[PDB]
Structure 1
Amino acid sequence: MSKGPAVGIDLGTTYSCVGVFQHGKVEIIANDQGNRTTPSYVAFTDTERLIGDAAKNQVAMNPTNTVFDAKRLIGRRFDDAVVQSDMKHWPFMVVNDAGRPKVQVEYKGETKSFYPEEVSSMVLTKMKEIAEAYLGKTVTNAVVTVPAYFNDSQRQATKDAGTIAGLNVLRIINEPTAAAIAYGLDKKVGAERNVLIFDLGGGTFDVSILTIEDGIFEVKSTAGDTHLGGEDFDNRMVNHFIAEFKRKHKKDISENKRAVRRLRTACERAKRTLSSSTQASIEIDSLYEGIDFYTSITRARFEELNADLFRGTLDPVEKALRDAKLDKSQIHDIVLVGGSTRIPKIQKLLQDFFNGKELNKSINPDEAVAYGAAVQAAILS
């Protein structure tokens, strides 16, 4: 294979995305399964190592040996409050190796430990292979994104993950900076502009305020909730339908894991439908004890069930503005990143907070960060 162009990779907590700037435009590259985003999952079995969709697809089968959330560990010390808190909820083992966290798994019948950058290199190897499979050319150069709050150790470890994956990391750039680059906010004529990045996706909520003066990006403030996402909105819908089944049939489906999973999957789909329709219907035959569950939910009810969570997204916005020493009227551009920003109520709440100001939302919010990184990668080529 001949030498290909440089790529932009958004290394995410739950999913990763790879893009390429070619023919004057960014193309978001689909994986082997035809998916534009790949789960940041690595599975270790008795026979193989699985990355992405193949790793996520077998998680139920191999929960302990399926690693995810490596990004929550990368560049951190074992005794970090974040590492110690997150550990309680992971099915895989996290061990201490001289102050450093390591994931401990069973791989081909052997106990093996991996540093978070070794796990993240496996995900980066997959993104590199996804790019090569599409282009039909070798891929070496890439721009990899990191959250704006990442420290020196977290940034170095992400760069190290790229080096292990055989990538030449051209630059490491902030996720909110990548999103501002995607919308070309650094190319707009005039004085300094204040940009608010509203990132609600990949199981985290990040609000960043940037000051772009003569194309130079300055992080003024970062705020958010590290454990907020679409899964929280799904849980509210699941709870609504569990209560509804109890009211209608006087039966509790909650201790039947398969019934709860069928309902949860149906709610994830229903939530997505409610971003474009005002009603979503669900038909689940023989959900529990032979009872068919045929129901529906309106966008209004979904908004009612999640009213506190949606409104609560404005608290890190106000905190970011306060820390940046800025009034909401001083924000020139608002950018929506993450899949959950597709929710019409979230858009409505945010636009109303900014007194009817139009939102930058044209670029697919799941792909905006890889998009900006692909633009940067082409610029640095």
Structure 2
Amino acid sequence: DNGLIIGIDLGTTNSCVSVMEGGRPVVLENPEGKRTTPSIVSYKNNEIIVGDAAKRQMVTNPNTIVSIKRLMGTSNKVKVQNADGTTKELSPEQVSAQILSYLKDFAEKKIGKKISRAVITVPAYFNDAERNATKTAGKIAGLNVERIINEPTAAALAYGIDKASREMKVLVYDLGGGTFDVSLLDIAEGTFEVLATAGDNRLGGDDWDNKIIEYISAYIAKEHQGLNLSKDKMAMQRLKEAAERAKIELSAQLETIISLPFLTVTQKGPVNVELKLTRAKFEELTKPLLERTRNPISDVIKEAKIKPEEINEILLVGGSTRMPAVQKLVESMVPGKKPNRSINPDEVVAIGAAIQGGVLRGDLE
């Protein structure tokens, strides 16, 4: 009853699990060797597949469920089809529980012990029904959910901001795969207060991917008309994979090559893609997405009735904050301050959850 409390970031796009070990948070690798796991679940009767293997069929398999977080707290159901043609209705709690179960299972094997306790994170804007859905998901997965904490709070814990000696105002800019959250926190006496939030729950790294897809589709259109490219699910799965890969490479390099031999066929033979995409062109194509992240910063400043100079620290959270242009935009909006991105931005929320778990378990060594 007083064992380890793991920390879980249950994201729209990806999930991550961490635990305290020897007085430091450790991020646990899944069985594919990855430190994050896609929040994606595929159903084949009783055989349920989670994570990377499910992401590889997200476009091609009608019984693969993505983006379930968006339904948490509602009584909407998702449907999957059994082998015998009957339909199975699933709650968001049930599908989320499969992601939580997968994390729990591989965590147990890595740690070498059974695990029955967790802290799970949620967006700051989640209401009681949304939080309760998340707790229920944990319960279905065999986890006593010791606390639900907010994602920006978790990130601040990871950076140790609660240990600050003076009162701190902290801006959290969190750009994930599906959603964009800006939060202004006040941390005083080791307690967190959310002063203001803003953002767009329909804006995230997927949109940047989708712009590259749009671009490739327009390239194809210069040489081919009437292809009906969307109806080719195989082609669409490949385009999504290629787009995300190209985007990621452009966070580190100034150019990337998109190569898609035999993408689809026309009456004159195969359609191929060989395109060099520079960072500058990628940034021009995605400028409207980037710019949409600016006003939410100013929104939180306005609502909290602060001046920009009152922001003591900025935290970059979410995988998309690896993009150079995003970093630059944030710098431009809080002049003088160097944002924090030293803790891997797609692990920082889970790390904070794990620190919260250690605190709840007690025992100072």
TM-score (norm 1): 0.87
> 70, 74, 80: which one pairs with 2:72?
74
Residue 306 in 1 paired to residue 282 in 2?
no
Match of residue 365 from structure 1: 345
> 129, 134, 137: which one pairs with 1:153?
129
1:229 deviates by 1.1
Match of residue 140 from structure 2: 164
Residue 333 in 1 paired to residue 308 in 2?
no
1:254 deviates by 5.6
Change (3 A) 1:287 1:183: same
> Unpaired segments of 5 or more residues in structure 1?
77-99
Question: For residue 39 of structure 1, what is the amino acid of its counterpart?
Answer: P
Match of residue 91 from structure 1: none
Partners of 1:30 and 1:229 lie apart in 2 by 24
Deviations 1:80-103 (A, max 9, x none): xxxxxxxxxxxxxxxxxxxx3233
Q: Secondary structure of the equivalent of 1:284?
A: strand
Question: For residue 212 of structure 2, what is the amino acid of its counterpart?
Answer: M
Question: For residue 71 of structure 1, what is the amino acid of its counterpart?
Answer: K
Contact 1:4 1:135 in 2 (8 A): no
Match of residue 206 from structure 1: 181
Change (3 A) 1:286 1:105: closer
What is the root-mean-square deviation in Å for CA atoms of aligned residues?
2.1
Deviations 1:6-32 (A, max 9, x none): 210111112211001112322111111
Contact 1:47 1:108 in 2 (8 A): no
Residue 255 in 1 paired to residue 235 in 2?
no
Match of residue 92 from structure 1: none
Question: For residue 229 of structure 2, what is the amino acid of its counterpart?
Answer: E
1:141 deviates by 1.4
| Structure 1 segment 47-196 matched on structure 2, within 5 A | 47-63=46-62, 65-76=63-74, 100-107=75-82, 109=84, 110-190=86-166, 192-196=167-171
Q: Secondary structure of the equivalent of 2:354?
A: helix
Q: Secondary structure of the equivalent of 2:147?
A: strand
Contact 2:158 2:355 in 1 (8 A): yes
Change (3 A) 1:282 1:316: same
Contact 1:10 1:17 in 2 (8 A): yes
Deviations 1:133-162 (A, max 9, x none): 211111111111011001111112211221
Contact 1:48 1:108 in 2 (8 A): no
Partners of 1:290 and 1:118 lie apart in 2 by 42
Question: For residue 177 of structure 1, what is the amino acid of its counterpart?
Answer: T
Match of residue 359 from structure 2: 379
| Structure 1 segment 180-329 matched on structure 2, within 5 A | 180-190=156-166, 192-247=167-222, 249=223, 251=225, 255=229, 257=232, 258-288=234-264, 289-329=269-309
What percentage of aligned pairs have identical amino acids? 48
Deviations 1:199-235 (A, max 9, x none): 1003011111110011100011111111111121122
Contact 2:59 2:236 in 1 (8 A): no
Q: Secondary structure of the equivalent of 1:105?
A: strand
1:69 deviates by 2.4
Q: Secondary structure of the equivalent of 2:251?
A: coil
Partners of 2:95 and 2:26 lie apart in 1 by 26
1:61 deviates by 4.6
Contact 1:242 1:253 in 2 (8 A): no
Partners of 1:154 and 1:296 lie apart in 2 by 43
Deviations 1:104-130 (A, max 9, x none): 333453433232222222221111112
Contact 1:242 1:252 in 2 (8 A): no
Partners of 1:292 and 1:114 lie apart in 2 by 39
Change (3 A) 1:287 1:123: closer
Residues 292-301 or 47-56, more deviating: 47-56
> How many residues get paired?
354
Q: Secondary structure of the equivalent of 2:125?
A: coil
Match of residue 94 from structure 1: none
Q: Secondary structure of the equivalent of 1:369?
A: helix
Contact 2:56 2:237 in 1 (8 A): no
Change (3 A) 1:250 1:121: closer
Q: Secondary structure of the equivalent of 2:162?
A: coil
1:55 deviates by 3.2
1:302 deviates by 0.8
Partners of 2:79 and 2:243 lie apart in 1 by 33
1:355 deviates by 1.1
Change (3 A) 1:106 1:322: same
TM-score (norm 2): 0.90
